[PDB]
Design a protein around this ligand. Structure first.
Ligand SMILES: *[C@@H]1O[C@H](CO)[C@@H](O[C@@H]2O[C@H](CO)[C@@H](O[C@@H]3O[C@H](CO)[C@@H](O)[C@H](O)[C@@H]3O)[C@H](O)[C@H]2NC(C)=O)[C@H](O)[C@H]1NC(C)=O
Ligand SMILES: *[C@@H]1O[C@H](CO)[C@@H](O[C@@H]2O[C@H](CO)[C@@H](O[C@@H]3O[C@H](CO)[C@@H](O)[C@H](O)[C@@H]3O)[C@H](O)[C@H]2NC(C)=O)[C@H](O)[C@H]1NC(C)=O
Ligand SMILES: *[C@@H]1O[C@H](CO)[C@@H](O[C@@H]2O[C@H](CO)[C@@H](O[C@@H]3O[C@H](CO)[C@@H](O)[C@H](O)[C@@H]3O)[C@H](O)[C@H]2NC(C)=O)[C@H](O)[C@H]1NC(C)=O
Lengths: 413, 413, 413
């Protein structure tokens, strides 16, 4: 029952030369040098060197756009004759507006002196948002990954590798394992940056999604493809009589999402960020908070009894078959892989979906000799990303683009 | 100060034969054979065998029922005389409806030609939902548990045991410890399955609970005991005049929860599932995602210095005393246990609430010699479950049924 | 590249005397005695003693106040002349109320017999909440910390220290490391206590924040500084005619947050609490749930090869420079520290913000020889707290008070 998925080693403890074991803050790097006694010869020694980089957070993100503050406005129009489609209105120039029409409701005692209409015209009323101000950048977390660069040297062996926070690196005589605490961040958290990235942000758990009303977090969003307006929500009413022009009233919410947030600002969680790097579909940074600690173990054994537990005679070859689903998505894309197994009856291994740069997901494949169809869910990437089936570092040269994510609001009156 | 709650071992490292140490994906199993040198005799060797099953997720769940898509409909009725209770209406046959009556509001200029009424009758108006379509199955997570079957053999010792993700298994000469990363799932997450279980689902963090409006996630739920309708929310209005029958208008939301979800579908998180098994109150599966890795440590020491740290002279006997609270609940049930302690002045131990199959919770009991009353919160089970006080595998033969969970909506106009 | 942030040790495994390794419930303490063979002399032995306390949870909190149940009431007033400011109304004495006025709308067929007014007066209508009952205490989690007291003795060495759940304690010959599972609690969770603390509580993920409507969790909050009333939300309407006094109607929600919670109570998560201790800005307790297990490792090596990995020649001195931001906040306060580095070219270390009792946060500082300006985010504390820049246990004697947190609702009609 072969697998290459166990990353570590089998050891005889009497034939081990060195063990490091400690907790380290994610934001801390660490360096260790020591001359170790040669187990082959007690009168000799060999250099051992360890280097650990600071832990980098990698979030695949959705660029939700800029959060807008706004002012609420209510205006009443009146035409004694003609329907509401015939007339342009002041509010129709605005970035976001709702209109409620009262066509054919002229009667008597709802009219100014100059209107003798009865059951005609249009008393159109508009609520609208102006004084639109960008207050911050908004990203929704699609997925999370935490990595350290690990460099080992034992005499003439030397290898650097990037290692996930609950993975191990294995060389001929050295194993390094990371064990990784709780995350401050979660998939689907929304991050709000009110200024530059370096100045940190706020985490939100309830950013508007399926139903964005004016007053919610993320109510008014501006993307480069255009505005995303919230629904208003509240009832309209004419006050009619005193031989005057009708005066509309709105009972719904008047105060914007941003203003409502700022008033109770200290109800939310902050985070800070050093060395931020933004890409099309990702945000990378180091969290300077030193209260988050990982566990590191290092073990040296320059002996033939040291087993790499990943070693197998099994050989695989990959071909990217087909794709469906979307890029930049927490639901994601479905990549189909044709996977040949040779030299083995069966093999349990990890098959990954990757582009040129990064991998966006991985499935545990239960392979039997010959061809195998394996499905992978990937989460992330952008318009142009060409996703390939991969194992270790070998990828299929066939790469497939995904479809755009469905992230649309539906604003039904 | 005796306790049996430390699961592991005390070791002299020079008298250890083997150490395995590695990271493994939850979805991966693993097998290891090796002939180890006999520490008693250097010219002999003994077989060591390790088998780890894939990690199974066990969620106690609530069957919230099926999520329904629907079409919104508004219809106006009119009777010139008689009150609204006297008449049956078209909308009253429908699965979900709200009605707003305007009794005794006939006046003049709110009537058709055939109605000379003044301050009489009934202008009943109905909003209602039809074209009800099941779109998926819905489960709310009550609790979570992650387990692997661990099998050890060292020569003539052999034991298999199911082990939680941050527990250890201990035999005469072998200890296996699991250390378990972050969970993709949380208690109170709601899982939506749009097709068969095997095709995966969506996680939701904001499924409607205390106030379900039409348009929310989970707005229209169908259980076998009947429909659960959302509230509508929006104002009504007659438009009256032109010597016609009154025409009602509704300003509230027209689009269903499902349709609003699907439009922005890629805002949410997917998960997938292999080997799903559904029961009355639980869902078990293996997550094929290979990016989630646990840490495994194995240590062999066939020596008398190897201590089982759980060993104590303390002896306990249990009796299930009484119960209150509910089954199938995140709040849960309160089981009272009478626990006798003998052979010891004091004893710290774990007392568990279990039925025939599984345990639903466990309390740390601080026992003193003689009788002790211990309370346990259990979370899960179903109508028929008979919960018993247990320690190790010994249970009280008395089992007690809990009461039904309160999971009702209250829809006040 | 010096750092003091690696908490643990470098070891030669053949020169180790003892290793303990096991899982332990958070609610369990543990004691271990053993006479170990003296490595210096095989015919002698030395006493080794380990004591671990139960794990204590420390939450910095916000006292949100008491959650109130209430009864909804709608009353209509009428004055044939004079505006609504001129008259006191029955509802104006109540703890929470909204009022909707219809000034100058007398007309004809909206009046009792005693009112011949036309376009005058005031038909004021009030919705209001009475029968206010406290149902529980409410705390919002600002931050979380999990600690155990660890006591070691190896012969003549003895040290007790409080250790975070993913930190290690290091002495001359002994290292103890804690590795800490998932948390049941998260920052920004709101905890509701319906009775005394000892009887446990409910966790909520959606407690009202930026927009509190009547019917929401936390809709009606009572603090010592006064009531916090929700918004109502729903439309008003006069029914007019039949030569009577106007009768107002409200279409919005009638049922309170509490009642709506209790109806579906078993949708939520409970927790329980032993040995609770409440302070101005914090809640400390031990969770009696025994299903949460940490990993403990202990390693003894009474040998000169045992390295304390935190040892450096680097020397620091601190001065608290300035502060901005707030106490009792998840966003928190920004403390500026002047940090002198001597004896070293560069130094990576942790700089903490603390008052007399506890530390409220810590930053990873990348120091170079001489003066360094370092920023720290602290989360927690109260009005009087005087926050100091600290490293190890040495603090600057200058302490600085923060500003009050902004936690206000804005209720715009
Ligand atoms: C790490 O990140 C936090 C959170 O972003 C930092 O606090 C932030 O500081 C900004 C400074 O602009 C504050 O936002 C606003 O500042 C203006 C003045 O520029 C002020 O008038 C407004 O009232 C508002 O507070 C805010 O305190 C805070 N950001 C947010 C989103 O609340 C913290 O200083 C950073 N720590 C570092 C660099 O060490
Ligand atoms: C693992 O689970 C995910 C999530 O459930 C799988 O993607 C799902 O595939 C279904 C297929 O029915 C998709 O739902 C709908 O499919 C119809 C066609 O049958 C389509 O017209 C609709 O627009 C809709 O997308 C959907 O992509 C997705 N499910 C959800 C709830 O979004 C994924 O394929 C699974 N991976 C495996 C088996 O490896
Ligand atoms: C640990 O904590 C849980 C949760 O707080 C405990 O259950 C709680 O017990 C209280 C007892 O007051 C219950 O609340 C109410 O009790 C009255 C009677 O006093 C009852 O008429 C109401 O219907 C309501 O249930 C409730 O079951 C529960 N608390 C909540 C907030 O739901 C559990 O007993 C505790 N376990 C221990 C001490 O071992």
């Amino acid at each position: 029952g072969w697998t290459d998925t166990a990353h570590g080693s089998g050891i005889i403890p009497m034939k081990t030369d060195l063990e490091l074991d400690f907790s380290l803050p994610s934001s801390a790097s660490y360096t260790y040098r020591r001359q170790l006694q040669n187990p082959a010869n007690e009168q000799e020694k060999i250099p051992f060197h360890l280097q650990l980089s600071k832990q980098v957070i990698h979030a695949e993100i959705q660029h939700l756009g800029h959060w807008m503050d706004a002012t609420f406005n209510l205006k009443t129009a009146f035409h004694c004759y003609g329907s509401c489609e015939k007339y342009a209105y002041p509010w129709q120039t605005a970035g976001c507006f709702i209109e409620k029409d009262y066509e054919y409701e002229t009667g008597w005692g709802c009219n100014p002196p100059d209107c003798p209409g009865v059951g005609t015209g249009c008393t159109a009323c508009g609520v609208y948002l102006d004084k639109l101000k960008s207050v911050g950048k908004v990203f929704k977390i699609v997925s999370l990954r935490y990595t350290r660069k690990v460099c080992i040297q034992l005499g003439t062996e030397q290898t650097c590798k990037t290692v996930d926070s609950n993975d191990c690196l294995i060389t001929t005589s050295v194993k390094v394992c990371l064990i990784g605490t709780i995350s401050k961040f979660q998939p689907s958290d929304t991050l709000l940056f009110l200024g530059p990235l370096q100045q940190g942000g706020l985490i939100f758990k309830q950013w508007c999604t399926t139903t964005c009303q004016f007053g919610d977090p993320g109510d008014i969003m501006s993307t480069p493809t255009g505005m995303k307006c919230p629904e208003l929500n509240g009832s309209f009413r004419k006050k009619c009589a005193f031989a005057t022009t009708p005066v509309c009233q709105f009972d719904g919410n008047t105060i914007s999402g941003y203003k409502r947030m700022i008033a109770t600002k200290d109800s939310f969680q902050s985070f800070n960020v050093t060395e931020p790097h933004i890409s099309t579909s990702a945000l990378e940074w180091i969290d300077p908070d030193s209260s988050l600690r990982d566990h590191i173990n290092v073990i040296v054994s320059r002996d033939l009894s040291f087993q790499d537990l990943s070693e197998t005679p099994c050989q695989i070859d990959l071909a990217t078959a087909s794709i469906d689903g979307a890029w930049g998505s927490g639901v994601g894309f479905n990549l189909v892989c044709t996977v040949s197994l040779t030299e083995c009856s069966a093999f349990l291994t990890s098959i990954k979906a990757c582009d040129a740069a990064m991998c966006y997901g991985s499935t545990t494949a239960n392979l039997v000799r010959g061809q195998n169809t394996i499905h992978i869910v990937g989460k992330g990437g952008h318009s142009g990303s060409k996703f390939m089936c991969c194992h270790d570092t070998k990828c299929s040269s066939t790469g497939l683009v995904a479809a755009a994510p469905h992230l649309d609001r539906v604003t039904g009156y």
